[PDB]
Design a binder for these strands. Structure first.
Length: 348
RNA sequence: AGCCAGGAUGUUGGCUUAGAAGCAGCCAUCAUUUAAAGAAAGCGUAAUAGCUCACUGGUCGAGUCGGCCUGCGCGGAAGA
RNA sequence: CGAUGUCGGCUCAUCACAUCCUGGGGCUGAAGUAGGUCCCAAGGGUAUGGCUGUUCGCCAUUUAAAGUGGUACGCGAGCUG
RNA sequence: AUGUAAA
RNA sequence: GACACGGUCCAGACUCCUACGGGAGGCAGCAGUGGGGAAUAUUGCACAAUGGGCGCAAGCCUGAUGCAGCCAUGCCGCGUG
RNA sequence: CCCGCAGAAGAAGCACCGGCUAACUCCGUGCCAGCAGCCGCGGUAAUACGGAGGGUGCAAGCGUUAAUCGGAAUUACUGGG
RNA sequence: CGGCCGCAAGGUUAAAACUCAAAUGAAUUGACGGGGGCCCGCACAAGCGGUGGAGCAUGUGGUUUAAUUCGAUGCAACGCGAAGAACCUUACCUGGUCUUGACAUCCACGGAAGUUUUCAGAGAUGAGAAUGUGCCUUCGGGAACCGUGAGACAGGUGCUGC
RNA sequence: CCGGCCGGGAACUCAAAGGAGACUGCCAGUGAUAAACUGGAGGAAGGUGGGGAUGACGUCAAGUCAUCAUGGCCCUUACGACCAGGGCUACACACGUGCUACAAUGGCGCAUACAAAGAGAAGCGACCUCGCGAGAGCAAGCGGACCUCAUAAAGUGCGUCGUAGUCCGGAUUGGAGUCUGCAACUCGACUCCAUGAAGUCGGAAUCGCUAGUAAUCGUGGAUCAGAAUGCCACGGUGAAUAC
RNA sequence: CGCUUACCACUUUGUGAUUCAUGACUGGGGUGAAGUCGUAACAAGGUAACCGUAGGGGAACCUGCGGUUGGAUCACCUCCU
RNA sequence: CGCGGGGUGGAGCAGCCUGGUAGCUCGUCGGGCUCAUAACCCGAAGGUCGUCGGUUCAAAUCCGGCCCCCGCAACCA
């Protein structure tokens, strides 16, 4: 848990403090950033671990020390100090679990898609839109339906939705993946628990900085004679333009009309169109290569979250939580699942 | 104008505690000792340290330093 | 418009330097080699094949280099078409 | 017409 | 008694020497090495015994053999009370 | 091969445990981690996965893999339709 | 694929790689037939009075909120559990409190139990003042009641009708 | 003082027990002279007279561990325990079940006749008085075939209303109130005044019924300090159709 | 000894057969816990099915011709031997 | 900016030419039919015709003015 992670951070702090005084390292800036993280973490760690060790010692020694009353009063004072130290350790964990980075402040795109069992997925994906809308209206987030493909017996097959504000992606990072469904559904007559799955993609903003300059100082413009037919004038004059980019290597050849300025206009518009095509193709490949890594095949396999409905259990594969509610979870209030994953993900 | 000197103690200053410390960027751009010193114009350091100028002394000892109005010039001014 | 034959190719070249190489120097973020940039200097040299009629371009391999242009973007009373 | 998978 | 393992010549492939005129070589022997592969051994002792070759015989050679070393590869037996 | 010295002293592992086929429970996950020669288990009360205990089988060997035959009269001449 | 035949469509002969522990044949018992025969029920036919159009009462779904407690949710849930929510009931929420406890038992110590009344507080409670001081005497003790301390535990209308 | 009020009786109504009777008992026809069917006579009741209870092996892995018990899981300075307030009654929408209606076989006012089944003591609460009223003050009888709830209503006579959203219907609202409870504001019931909407017979579609049923009308009880149109139970009038 | 003829190996040229990998592209085959559309076959499967052949259609498939029951119904017609 | 097509339920179209009326398909919501879905049926909402001005008894229409999407914009013998 966090105690096994804090010890490795304290050992890395004690190693970096010894390596800093050895004076054998030329580069020191990354070592100074590591020492800054060490001064942020290991001081509160050495406070909280020593306070918890002294509290556990003063409790376990005075609990069975021949049933004394003065040792019991000393253990009560140590328990008050233990409550103060536990509040200080919770404040230190809340300070260490803070999203300082400005990439966490960005908006997001949620893509809830159906997996196994279409009818079940539709019921489930519509309820997950309901689940994150309930979650989103609690903190006052804006929910806009960008695209929603309907199912058969209700729900939706694919939902792509923008959520805007201040800090959507940094709070909803850990939701890309699969979701189990164990339910007794409304579409099933028999009444046997079934397994259904749904896949959720979480995408960041990535704001469009499009249309770089054409850079006529970087354009190589070759004005040479044209091939073909038509007149004496074509032979005398060039009437053909080839423009090549230096940083991308895009070549556009125009031999269309008589005047070169109509040809100049086409030989710049095709450059702009091919720049826009080659940049939007790379952007759509960068979207797809991340979506195929976040969204799996869609099967019933374990992908980080398992939800149990007839037993009353919510068990995730990372940070094995055992919350037996399923009623304060179905109507917003997803703090207890999301927060400790952040707390022991920012420990690394 | 040259020549023998000075050109300080806290300023590791609070700053985003990784450091910006007279000199990346913030603002404050203090005050003493005072022949004189801007908490700094430049060089050099991860930051220091260090090196000059600002300015003040002394030898020296007669004119010198910087802007403005114009006339004629200089360069930019390279072809078959 | 009572006539100046134009493109590309072969041969033949001439001239300017806004110099591709060779030559002499300055700065460098020039340890040496190999470099980047600037000045003077035209004395000499400044490719071979595939494609395309193509000038040009790409490729393959050399070279110290595969210079830019003018001369009716040279040259048909020198030659094809 | 349809009623996807777990005795 | 071979149209010839440790004989000859010619033609071809591969290593080595050369003073470049030309030559040496053929572990599908025992050992041992590279390569292949999941996979397989020691560059050991001696003719003490047999057998083969030569010699009248004594004697000589024998990586066949008689063994020794390694591998639980297979079988058998014993112990770990 | 025989005698003497000393001290239980130096010498026990491998597979399996639902049926075929020899042997039972507990804990940890939870159609996941995984096992498996076939039927097949694991979906929060697992005699099947992992760990512990116990038992079973074989023994300096034990399991897996690869090949042949039998079972297979499922190549039928013995011995099918 | 190959060989042969044919004007062609194509026909004849005839594999291999790969996948699975099933495929198929007859037959029994249930299920069903918009298959047949027979029989029954306000099932159809005929009629009566209704619902759905309006207002009110109740319950549910959905929405909102601190909860709008939980279960039932096709016939077989929806004036259902509830044969009756102002507090109580209440299992829900907000706020203030108690933890061997509100309730069951064991040990040690102290005290008749009880009654009246006052102060602060939303009240639980906290802090008091008087009165009463027996049923058997091993009389260091009893048979009940009350308060304190520790462990066994208690408690749960928390989950699972799968 | 005609009130079964008092004598007086065990006939009769009512009432409780024990029995009788109704069991295809008999006849005629038909049917295999068998089971059985139809019709007829007696009878109050014809062929299980009528109704209720009594629910076959099994199906729905149908519901309840929230009535209870219980395996195992969990909390055990808490998800356990107590207190005050709020909520379970909130509301842009939809559905289910019932009541009141949309009127003239009907409304209003006066007079008047006929019930069964029940409940009652930290209860029913006569009679008298006051209040338009819900109820209040005083206070018998009864743990009961006597006492109380308790005047039954539709039904009948008479007068009015003339087919209009009107004298139908009664939602909602304001004021003054009454009962209970410690407290009626969220969030009880009832009465008076005043207002008095939608609704003029209902789209697609759908429900129950074959007899004292359908429909209509009233009463009582369980729950309960107070709080039903719901549930249970009783009674009055009472059809039509079944080829 | 040299010469020359006959046999003749390595090698070279020309043209075929067979086989192994590779080859842009294309067709069909087997696998998928979830796909889109249709319901073609199993009851008379709601147009009875199957086979051969020709044509058509996004697709199970449809239509015509020939064969077979590996098909139900035959208390609905009326009258009957 | 110059030219044209235009701006009719949430979306397509009639209806403008040639004025006496806001209409029809699709879609949305709700209820039925079925154990449930599809199909089918019923009911409701939805535009004042892109906006404004003028003629007319009457402008969705006839005409004109101002804003918004779309396509074109200097070529060839």
């Amino acid at each position: 848990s966090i105690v096994a992670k804090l010890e490795a951070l304290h050992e890395r702090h004690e190693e970096v403090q010894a390596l800093l005084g050895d004076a054998q390292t030329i580069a020191d800036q990354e070592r100074f950033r590591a020492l800054s993280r060490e001064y942020a973490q290991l001081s509160d760690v050495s406070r909280c671990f020593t306070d918890w060790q002294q509290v556990q010692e003063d409790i376990e020694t005075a609990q069975m020390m021949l049933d004394d009353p003065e040792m019991r009063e000393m253990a009560q004072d140590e328990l008050r100090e233990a409550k103060e130290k536990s509040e200080q350790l919770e404040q230190q964990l809340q300070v260490l679990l803070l999203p300082k980075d400005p990439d966490d402040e960005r908006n997001a795109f949620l893509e809830v898609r159906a997996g196994t069992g279409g009818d079940e997925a539709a019921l489930f994906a519509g309820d997950l839109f309901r689940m994150y809308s309930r979650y989103a209206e609690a903190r006052r987030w804006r929910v806009e339906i960008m695209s929603a493909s309907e199912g058969e017996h209700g729900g939706y097959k694919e939902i792509i939705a923008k959520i805007c504000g201040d800090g959507v992606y940094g709070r909803l990072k850990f939701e890309s993946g699969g979701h189990r469904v164990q339910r007794v559904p409304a579409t099933e007559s028999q009444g046997r628990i079934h397994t259904s799955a749904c896949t959720v993609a979480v995408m960041p903003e990535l704001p469009d900085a499009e249309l770089p300059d054409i850079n006529p100082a970087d354009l190589r413009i070759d004005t040479f004679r044209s091939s073909g037919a038509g007149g004496q004038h074509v032979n005398t004059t060039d009437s053909a333009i080839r423009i090549t980019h230096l940083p991308t290597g895009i070549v556009v050849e125009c031999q269309d009309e008589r005047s070169q300025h109509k040809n100049k206009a086409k030989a710049l518009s095709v450059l702009g169109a091919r720049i826009h095509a080659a940049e939007m193709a790379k952007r759509q490949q960068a979207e797809a290569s991340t979506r195929r890594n976040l969204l799996g095949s869609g099967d019933r396999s374990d992908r980080n979250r398992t939800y149990n409905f007839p037993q009353g259990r919510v068990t995730d594969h990372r940070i094995n939580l055992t919350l037996y509610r399923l009623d304060e979870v179905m109507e917003g209030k997803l703090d207890m699942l999301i927060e400790p994953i952040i707390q022991e993900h920012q420990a690394d």
